[PDB]
Amino acid sequence: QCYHGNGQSYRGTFSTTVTGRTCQSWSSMTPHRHQRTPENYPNDGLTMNYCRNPDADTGPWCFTMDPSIRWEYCALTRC
Ligand SMILES: O=C(O)CCC1CCNCC1
């Protein structure tokens, strides 16, 4: 599955990182405490634990459910 451009506007349901880790939900502070929440960023599609690029990175990403890995890019290709 692919994303367009830098993935900022990707709104798909992929939730797996490039190392096979599972994305943390954006609204959750567990395991990673963060500020990129749908409450703060209501228009970036920060739904469940779906891969997103709300901060002008270069591809969709997420905080990971591994407490030792803050975040990773998602295992998506560029369209
Ligand atoms: O630690 C955080 O809150 C975010 C770290 C990076 C998330 C991926 N894009 C660059 C910043």
mmCIF file of N, CA, C and O and ligand atoms in Angstrom, residues 34 55 57 61 63 70-71, ligand 1:
data_model
loop_
_atom_site.group_PDB
_atom_site.id
_atom_site.type_symbol
_atom_site.label_atom_id
_atom_site.label_comp_id
_atom_site.label_asym_id
_atom_site.label_seq_id
_atom_site.Cartn_x
_atom_site.Cartn_y
_atom_site.Cartn_z
ATOM 1 N N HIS A 34 3.124 11.947 24.665
ATOM 2 C CA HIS A 34 3.349 12.839 23.556
ATOM 3 C C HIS A 34 2.216 13.855 23.420
ATOM 4 O O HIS A 34 1.238 13.797 24.134
ATOM 5 N N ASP A 55 3.178 16.061 11.000
ATOM 6 C CA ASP A 55 4.227 17.029 11.329
ATOM 7 C C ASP A 55 5.234 17.255 10.197
ATOM 8 O O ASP A 55 6.407 17.536 10.449
ATOM 9 N N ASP A 57 6.804 15.320 8.208
ATOM 10 C CA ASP A 57 7.896 14.384 8.005
ATOM 11 C C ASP A 57 7.848 13.978 6.526
ATOM 12 O O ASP A 57 7.290 14.709 5.719
ATOM 13 N N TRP A 61 3.942 7.886 9.715
ATOM 14 C CA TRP A 61 4.692 7.290 10.795
ATOM 15 C C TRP A 61 3.769 7.133 12.001
ATOM 16 O O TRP A 61 2.622 7.494 11.955
ATOM 17 N N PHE A 63 4.056 6.647 16.657
ATOM 18 C CA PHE A 63 4.700 6.184 17.860
ATOM 19 C C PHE A 63 4.473 4.676 17.880
ATOM 20 O O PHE A 63 3.422 4.218 17.430
ATOM 21 N N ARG A 70 10.530 5.043 20.213
ATOM 22 C CA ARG A 70 9.622 6.176 20.274
ATOM 23 C C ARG A 70 8.673 6.198 19.087
ATOM 24 O O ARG A 70 7.457 6.245 19.250
ATOM 25 N N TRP A 71 9.249 6.156 17.893
ATOM 26 C CA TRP A 71 8.467 6.241 16.684
ATOM 27 C C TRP A 71 9.218 5.594 15.529
ATOM 28 O O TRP A 71 10.438 5.447 15.573
HETATM 29 O O1 LIG B 1 9.109 12.543 19.897
HETATM 30 C C1 LIG B 1 8.110 13.060 19.213
HETATM 31 O O2 LIG B 1 7.206 13.549 19.802
HETATM 32 C C2 LIG B 1 8.099 13.033 17.697
HETATM 33 C C3 LIG B 1 9.453 12.654 17.141
HETATM 34 C C4 LIG B 1 9.453 12.645 15.604
HETATM 35 C C5 LIG B 1 8.203 11.978 15.046
HETATM 36 C C6 LIG B 1 8.479 11.745 13.566
HETATM 37 N N1 LIG B 1 8.617 13.025 12.911
HETATM 38 C C7 LIG B 1 9.692 13.861 13.464
HETATM 39 C C8 LIG B 1 9.545 14.034 14.987
#
